[PDB]
Amino acid sequence: SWQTYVDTNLVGTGAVTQAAIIGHDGNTWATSAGFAVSPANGAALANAFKDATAIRSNGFELAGTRYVTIRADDRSVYGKKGSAGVITVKTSKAILIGVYNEKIQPGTAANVVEKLADYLIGQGF
């Protein structure tokens, strides 16, 4: 049911346009219609959590878009591209990812992902 967390719990909220749930390895668990992240690109994100030295300076890519590091801790890596961007949140077993555009506010996006992450962590994922 990882597809429902995406269709309903993420994209369904309206706060995010595209979304996915990656494994700590980079391999996609579930994803939305027009979004895909390469294994290399996902394992690259899964690591910026151990040290964002690299993304902090070069930035990071997701599905062909080069994002700029805004925030980047050991649980949350945020990026932006003009007035759109992506929220990525690490759980105990996964990594949530939701992208937003100009019609959506960064905190609105950020809030939905953040909260869902809490819920899954509470569940053991």
UniProtKB/Swiss-Prot annotation:
Swiss-Prot/TrEMBL keywords: Actin-binding, Cytoplasm, Cytoskeleton, Methylation
UniProt cross-references to SMART domains, sorted A to Z: PROF (SM00392)
InterPro entries xref list: PFN, PFN_euk, PFN_sf, Profilin_CS
Domain of life per record: Eukaryota
Signal peptide: none
MF GO annotations: actin monomer binding
Main subcellular location of this protein, as a coarse class: cytoplasm
Subunit structure: Occurs in many kinds of cells as a complex with monomeric actin in a 1:1 ratio.
Protein name: Profilin-2
Lineage, broadest ranks: Eukaryota, Amoebozoa, Discosea, Longamoebia, Centramoebida
